[PDB]
């Protein structure tokens, strides 16, 4: 879905690179680890910069794993992560990039929004929507919906996947609900509000059937009950919103289906507070009343979610891409400055060590 | 005095061997969830913790899944959420992960504390990092989570003296000629009663010795 | 003698004979034996009623105040004695135990009424 200019790797290919044989750097780090000493972030940077084959991808994965489990794990630089993803894309190794991203705890791969978009768009161009969905779920887990381009791409992929899905496991419901709620909150349009409603409906179903811990545990979600109430609040907000904002009929149908299905371990809640299973009938009545109110106000959209998201993508992704490319160029310049400072520090330390050794 | 040099030699060797064979957090604070015992020492955890140990997460079990180990993020605790209605949390400023951990789920952390809505001036080390009691505040919820309106905290400024001590104070006053009728009072405004679950000084806390 | 850490505490040292207890209120290092070395004797406590039906407690209030002002701790029985004397507030557990005994006697009275 992204332009060739956004996906172009020429400027990254033109980065100033100091050439090494990957075997030499690997042996140096092996000696360092054997001596139980810390490895510099510059060394791992040089190894990742000097991947020249698909087997060097396999070796660099192992050395990333070893660096993550070392005293200087925190110092893995952003340009190194970007280069790792670029190399994986270059040598037809998207599966390895996805593997490291999924096991980010073991490898320390925490991409920026540009790098997420690169990976997700590669998967989308190859029509591998399953892996694109995996990348979207990783973006959700990392809470990286701060850039509009990522939000739009994630919404597109999510609605594409939901358009052809019937069987829902509660983990799948939880992941889909979170991944649609987070970008839906940052988009103040009809698509964003419909995504908010759909995700709140899914999370409320998960909460009522499996419990609130199933919702918030190891998720970027809050531990407060009342997700269905928040969906109804989204409907209420749309009712008092300007003319242009609307709600897709599909999201309303999903919420209605969830309520119709719901109305047919440690206790974390105070016994004086009313449970959700007891407020289901009132939620249903509120849903029917608000649905009639929205239908009267003409705040219901008949277009499907996927088509509406496609149209929004076509309208906004170009300007989002322009902004992202500008920020990416700024980042590359700053990274070059930082890398040259690191190289100078190493050279100065080595020369001072030689000066001392000469005595 | 005949010198005792073997004692000094043994003390120095023991100090060196303790500083070189230090047990790591991944070893000290590992837990067998089936039996709820520490494999390092074999001691069983207290009963009141068992459920939490099987449901909640350690702090770096959360921080290892975040960029920069979650610097600047807000982390709260389940016990604080249950006990207190006002927001209690840490704003992280520095993290030292235990690289020897297989999942990088052990380590140390520093941050700025807000307890019951009162933020501290400086950042200090976080205690109970190894407890299974930690939750991560979502970015889109922070504004709602952090919101707090300071209620008027007007408490007693003075209390009566105990009966016999009051009687003795008054008797001494009348002995020294004073005839004023004001009741003796104990000022209690400078005695601030700190909640028992307020975070303590982790820098002053000890560490389990290797064995 | 040098103890590792420790502090001064005002407590009750037990003397007397079998089935005839008597207490000396003393300020001593907490690590010392109960009836062993002490820093100062601050009073006495006879828990057996005398011929006048009285439990006699002697308290050196000046020296007790001095040692509290020098950093000495208090054992729970000593805090309860000082609360009974009116020198301290009544300890929370005297109040709680009194309430518990009131409830128990109320239950007994209710049992008698039910019978």
């Amino acid at each position: 879905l992204l332009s060739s200019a956004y996906v172009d790797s020429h400027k990254w290919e033109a980065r100033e690179k100091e050439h090494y044989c990957l075997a030499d750097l690997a042996s140096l780090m092996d000696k360092t680890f054997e001596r139980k000493l810390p490895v510099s972030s510059l060394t791992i940077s040089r190894l990742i910069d000097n991947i020249s084959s698909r087997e060097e991808i396999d070796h660099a994965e192992y050395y990333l794993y070893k660096f993550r489990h070392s005293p200087n794990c925190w110092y893995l630089r952003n340009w190194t992560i970007h280069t790792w993803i670029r190399q994986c894309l270059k040598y037809d190794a998207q599966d390895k990039a996805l593997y490291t991203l999924v096991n980010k705890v073991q490898y320390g791969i925490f991409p920026d929004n540009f790098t997420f978009n690169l990976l997700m768009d590669s998967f989308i161009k190859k029509e591998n929507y399953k892996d694109a969905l995996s990348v979207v779920f990783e973006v959700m887990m990392q809470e990286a919906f701060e850039v509009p381009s990522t939000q739009l791409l994630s919404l597109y992929v999510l609605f594409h996947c939901l358009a052809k899905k019937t069987d829902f496991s509660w983990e799948e419901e939880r992941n889909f609900g979170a991944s649609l709620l987070l970008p839906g909150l940052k988009q103040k349009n009809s698509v964003g509000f419909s995504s908010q409603l759909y995700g709140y409906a899914l999370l409320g179903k998960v909460e009522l059937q499996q419990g609130l811990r199933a919702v918030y545990h190891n998720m970027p979600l809050i531990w407060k009950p009342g997700y269905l109430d928040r969906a109804l609040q989204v409907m209420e907000k749309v009712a008092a919103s300007p003319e242009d904002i609307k709600l897709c009929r599909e999201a309303l149908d999903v919420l209605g289906a969830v309520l119709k299905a719901l109305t047919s371990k440690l206790v974390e809640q105070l016994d004086i507070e009313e449970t959700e299973q007891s407020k289901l009938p009132q939620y249903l009545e509120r849903f029917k009343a608000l649905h009639s109110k929205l239908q009267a106000l003409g705040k219901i959209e008949s277009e499907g979610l996927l088509s509406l998201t496609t149209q929004l993508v076509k309208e906004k992704l170009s300007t989002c891409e322009a902004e992202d490319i500008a920020t990416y160029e700024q980042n590359l310049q700053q990274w070059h400055l930082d890398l040259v400072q690191l190289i100078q520090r190493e050279q100065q330390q080595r020369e001072q060590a030689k000066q001392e050794y000469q005595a | 005095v005949r010198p005792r040099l073997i004692a000094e030699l043994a003390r120095r060797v023991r100090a060196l061997r303790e500083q070189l064979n230090r047990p790591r957090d991944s070893q000290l604070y590992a837990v067998d969830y089936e039996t709820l015992t520490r494999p390092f020492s074999g001691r069983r955890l207290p009963v009141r913790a068992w459920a939490d140990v099987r449901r909640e997460s350690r702090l770096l079990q959360l921080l290892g899944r975040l960029p920069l180990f979650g610097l600047g993020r807000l982390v709260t605790r389940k016990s604080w959420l249950w006990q207190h209605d006002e927001p209690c949390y840490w704003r992280l400023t520095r993290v030292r992960p235990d690289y020897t951990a297989q999942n990088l789920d052990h380590g140390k952390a520093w941050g700025i504390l807000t307890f019951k809505g009162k933020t501290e001036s400086e950042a200090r080390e976080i205690e109970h990092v190894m407890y299974h009691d930690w939750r991560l505040v979502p970015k889109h919820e922070e504004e709602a989570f952090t919101a707090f309106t300071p209620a008027p905290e007007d408490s007693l400024a003075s209390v009566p003296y105990p009966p016999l001590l009051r009687a003795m104070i008054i008797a001494e006053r009348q002995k020294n000629g004073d005839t004023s009728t004001e009741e003796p009072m104990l000022n209690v405004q400078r005695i601030r009663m700190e909640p028992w679950d307020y975070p303590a000084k982790q820098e002053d806390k000890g560490r389990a010795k290797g064995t | 003698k040098a103890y590792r850490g420790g502090h001064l505490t005002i407590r009750l040292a037990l003397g007397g004979c079998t089935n005839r207890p008597f207490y000396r209120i003393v300020a001593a290092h907490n690590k010392c034996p109960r009836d062993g070395r002490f820093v100062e004797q601050l009073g006495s406590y006879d828990p057996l009623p005398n011929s006048h039906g009285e439990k006699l407690v002697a308290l050196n209030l000046d020296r007790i105040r001095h040692w509290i002002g020098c950093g000495a701790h208090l054992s729970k029985p000593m805090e309860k004695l000082l609360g009974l004397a009116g020198f301290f507030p009544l300890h929370p557990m005297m109040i709680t135990n009194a309430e518990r005994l009131r409830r128990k006697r109320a239950r007994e009275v209710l049992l008698a009424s039910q019978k």
């Binding site: 105070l270 016994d271 004086i272 | 006990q83 | 009131r102 409830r103 109320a106 007994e108 009275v109």
Partner: peptide
């Protein structure tokens, strides 16, 4: 105590609770 605090304690000590005690008798029962 307020009912909210009693419920908070009832949550804190699930499964390890005694019968709640009311106000004690005003005087010592005879």
């Amino acid at each position: 105590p307020p009912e909210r605090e009693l419920s908070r304690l009832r949550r804190l000590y699930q499964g390890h609770l005694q019968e709640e005690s009311g106000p004690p008798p005003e005087s010592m029962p005879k």
